[PDB]
Design a binder for these strands. Structure first.
Lengths: 93, 107, 98, 83, 7, 93, 107, 86, 95
DNA sequence: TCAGGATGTATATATCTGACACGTGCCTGGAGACTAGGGAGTAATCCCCTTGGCGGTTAAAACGCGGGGGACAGCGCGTACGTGCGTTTAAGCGGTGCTAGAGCTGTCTACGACCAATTGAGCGGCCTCGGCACCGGGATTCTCCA
DNA sequence: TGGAGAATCCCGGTGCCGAGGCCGCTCAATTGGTCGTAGACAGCTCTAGCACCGCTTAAACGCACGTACGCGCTGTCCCCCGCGTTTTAACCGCCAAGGGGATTACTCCCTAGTCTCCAGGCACGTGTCAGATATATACATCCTGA
């Protein structure tokens, strides 16, 4: 049956960064596992944040606060900047 | 009207719809905001880009054009912030950074 | 006269070799037999996938490398170069396993 | 004249020495091996315990890599490269 | 087995 | 507003185990926090267990497995014994 | 028509209905079983009784009738299994176990 | 209208207090350089906890840091504390 | 006059038998306010939050001193040094 | 080794208070009863992934007691940390004043849930070559008895 | 200090199999609506955190002094470094069984949802006695002397 994966997305991101670099299958699986782990961490932290505030909806603010809590310093700042740019451009469109 | 992917609307490579579905069926909350999947996809793409560029630099520093788990370990352990983020994660076939203590060196 | 190295140079060369290499250091089949024997004490007639044994070996090797690193740090702090069981015990106690 | 060769000794002196050298150890005492074997036995016992519990919960008889990875994550030892 | 807490 | 807590239940258990023993407010709060923490841990374990098995219902078996994973050894054995007895006597009447 | 608490049906002290409500409103899954709240209440009741017995014994050993956080800490830390269960938990007004190293003693 | 800036209260952790804490931990003899390193570690720990506590405070649109935020931060840091709520 | 050490063990026993706080409340509160000033301005603090912070800090410091004493005894000494604290924190994974 | 002086620590008594045990109104959360739908149990099937000698290598698995540098015990020293004492500083309590902000309440509008139709992007299956593993050979580099 | 000797890196040739590209084929992503409700926002209440002052007194502080322990040095010794090849000394490739994990199809009964009704615990007073505090006193232990 169809099995979910992030292969094409990671490959496209690398092509955008390194146009002439390939990835081994094992490293690709490591990439997919890392993406899934970060997804789970952020989603769980956001759910905890929403539960603490007696909220029933996960908005951009909760995910942003989760990013600030989990990502140290410059990583959090750059992730916040990129996400804010993405959400602003999506709202504009 | 033709359908446009939400990733294209936000100029992102990660799938907004896929992560939105994962959030909806992940039993995290009763309701899910519209911009939260986009923001999360942007954060995930940024982290993936950071790791991939570091791994590419590590591979190029070894005269290799193919990303191997060894390059992943090199890239992750050489960045203090990323090492702090992934300090509890073990990478298969990643190896160990060359590190010989000063006392162990010949004198 | 025979050319036999001073003690220590070979040790450093081996350290460099296995810090540059990333392959398994434990024999696969003995480790698989040990895993099967350990699991026999929990449930009889259990089957193991190859990938499960591979992941077990990777995790065990990584944990052993970390433990030996901590033991080496303890031995150096103890003004010694030869690791001792008490160093391992101290490392595990500080970690929280004892 | 034989109860000489055995299984639990399968983790040999060369293997433990190689692991220590990869860990940065330069000189190893002879008593390190038994303690290392005991620690490895304890770690494997805990991980396999969790893995078998997950397998029994799933009405299965074959322990998959998913069970081992999930046990490692439950023990704060998340592993990348297996799912 | 039951009611045999080692403590 | 009214505050929800386990104070009276813990008091009744204490009277059942020690009729002539009292309890302080700080100890009551500590007991309530411990009960809430254990409840959260068991619920999360069960939810994750059900999620891995593509199941959307927490049954008695999920709670049993969560107790086995979380409680070490004899604690888990006594807990599963008590839970089995309780559920059996509940479903038998 | 005569109502009756579910805890009395199972002979438990913690409220089955409250546990069921918490499970339903905790965002764990779409549905929850009928016997899961009873099982969780039984486990919680057993843990509470087990910790309270040791706490009462510790309080009695100190010529006290009211359990204080010090007795709770002593009961938790003096039990090996309970110490493992709460190995990352710190108790306010609990202090530490009396422990002095042998090498520090005079001889 | 008074914006008071406090400074150099890290010296408020007196040497006798550190000695008492070491005595509770079983330390018999204390070097003179211990105090400064202990103060540094203490400052780092409170910086780490308070960063998360203030982040939780901003998230909830509050100007007052409650005990619940501190407990949540400690639990997120694997230092769950009993006797203050939650 | 007592020989050096006897009062040390006496204080060890006294503080291991007692449970009250060992850090002055007002200096610790001022330190907390200084540290919070680096993140947000004009922050207000509840008394219970300050007490919880002090309790957690004291518990962590006691554990760190226990590990430091163990490391010092491992080195065949009886006097703790900053190197012991650094080793304990490194093994703990904090650095 | 045994014994007296000085010290702190454990023990007994009084009384005295404030925190804990108890009682009370009620209202909101728990208990009863009926319905419907879908998720879980059960049955049958596919086939993919896990275990042992004629007609078997050969290198780890462990022999042979010849044999240098670090573990370990002892010793001397002198500085630094513990112990005691007078002064001074600031912690702690309580009392007063005030306000920013925590906490509660009423709308109601915009946002998300849900369903139906539609379709193209990702996933399963299948080539196809070139970057990388192996090897052999020589230059380069590290270690050691002089 | 320096070549002998061994280990390592590099240069180049050759074979291999795993990643990149291609081609179907769904079914999950997109769009267009309709419909319920979550909390944004405004308004009000009223609680404690802040700031300051005044008194009391315990703890931090500086200093003097004594002694004991970390440290440097020196001498002894042991073990597992080491190569130097048995008596009989773990991986491959195989082929083969078959059983359970995965998949598909029916079905049935368990729980979410809704409505109704009632009493259990939660806020709020209200007494009262167990430990806090204080004092007086007996016993254990260290220090020093003999």
């Amino acid at each position: 049956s169809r099995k979910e994966s992030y292969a094409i997305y990671v490959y496209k991101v690398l092509k955008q960064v390194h146009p002439d670099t390939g990835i081994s299958s094992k490293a690709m699986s490591i990439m997919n596992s890392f993406v899934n782990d970060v997804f789970e961490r952020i989603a769980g932290e956001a759910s905890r944040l929403a539960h603490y505030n007696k909220r029933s909806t996960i908005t951009s603010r909760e995910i942003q606060t989760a990013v600030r809590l989990l990502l140290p310093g410059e990583l959090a700042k750059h992730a916040v900047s990129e996400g804010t740019k993405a959400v602003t451009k999506y709202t504009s469109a | 009207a033709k359908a446009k992917t939400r990733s294209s609307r936000a100029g992102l490579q990660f799938p907004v719809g896929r992560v939105h579905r994962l959030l909806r069926k992940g039993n995290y909350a009763e309701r899910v905001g519209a911009g939260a999947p986009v923001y999360l996809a942007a954060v995930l793409e940024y982290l993936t880009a950071e790791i991939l560029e570091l791994a590419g630099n590590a591979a190029r520093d070894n005269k290799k054009t193919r990303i191997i788990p060894r390059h992943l370990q090199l890239a992750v352990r050489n960045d203090e912030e990323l090492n702090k983020l992934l300090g509890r994660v073990t990478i298969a076939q990643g190896g160990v950074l060359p590190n010989i203590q000063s006392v162990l060196l010949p004198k | 006269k025979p050319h036999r190295y001073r003690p220590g140079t070979v040790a450093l060369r081996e350290i460099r070799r296995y810090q540059k290499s990333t392959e398994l250091l434990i024999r696969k089949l003995p480790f698989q037999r040990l895993v099967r024997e350990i699991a026999q004490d929990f449930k009889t007639d259990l089957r193991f996938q190859s990938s499960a044994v591979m992941a077990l070996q990777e995790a065990s090797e990584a944990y052993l490398v970390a433990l030996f690193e901590d033991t080496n740090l303890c031995a150096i702090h103890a003004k010694r170069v030869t690791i001792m069981p008490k160093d391992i015990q101290l490392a595990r106690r500080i970690r929280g396993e004892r | 004249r034989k109860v000489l060769r055995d299984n639990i000794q399968g983790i040999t002196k060369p293997a433990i020495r190689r692991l220590a050298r990869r860990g940065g150890v330069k000189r190893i005492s002879g008593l390190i091996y038994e303690e290392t074997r005991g620690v490895l036995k304890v770690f494997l016992e805990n991980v396999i315990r969790d893995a078998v519990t997950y397998t029994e919960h799933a009405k299965r008889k074959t322990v998959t890599a998913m069970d081992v990875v999930y046990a490692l994550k439950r023990q704060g030892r998340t592993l990348y490269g297996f799912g | 087995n039951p009611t045999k807490r080692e403590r």
